[PDB]
């Protein structure tokens, strides 16, 4: 990620030792009785089971 | 992943959708020579 933003961005405007997680999911349309819309109340990040 | 495609442009060899008007524009497919 970049925490230092000016009116123009250099390559050094991006930070080191920082990370942003990205995930891509594809629902399957035809599942049993499966619902059209998927809802999420809570998202969590775990490491070592904690 | 270099690139991702979730949908596709209509193909020329499609009799069903070839002679129809969709979204105000007639339908044309893709051709390779």
């Amino acid at each position: 990620p970049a925490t230092n933003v000016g009116t123009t961005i250099s390559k050094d405007s991006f930070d080191r030792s920082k990370a942003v997680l990205i995930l891509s999911f594809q629902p399957p349309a035809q599942v049993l009785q499966g619902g059209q819309a998927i809802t999420i109340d809570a998202i969590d990040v775990l490491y070592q089971g904690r | 992943v270099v690139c991702h495609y979730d949908s596709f442009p209509m193909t020329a060899d499609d009799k069903y959708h070839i002679g129809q008007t969709i979204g105000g524009l007639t339908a044309f497919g893709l051709v390779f020579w």
Binding site: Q30, V31, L32, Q33 | -
Partner: protein, 51 residues
């Protein structure tokens, strides 16, 4: 003669609700779509590329 009339109306009510349960249950069943199982992977006749 209160008990005699009361009991009669109660019998009719329970019968009507039971029959309604049946229609609803059976309609609920045979109402599951499911899926198809895609065939075995397609054999690769060729893989190539051009400009």
């Amino acid at each position: 003669v209160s008990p005699v009339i009361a009991t009669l109306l109660l019998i009719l009510i329970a019968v009507a609700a039971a029959v309604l349960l049946y229609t609803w249950v059976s309609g609920l069943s045979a109402n599951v779509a499911g899926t198809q199982v895609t065939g075995k992977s397609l054999t690769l006749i060729q893989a190539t590329w051009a400009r």
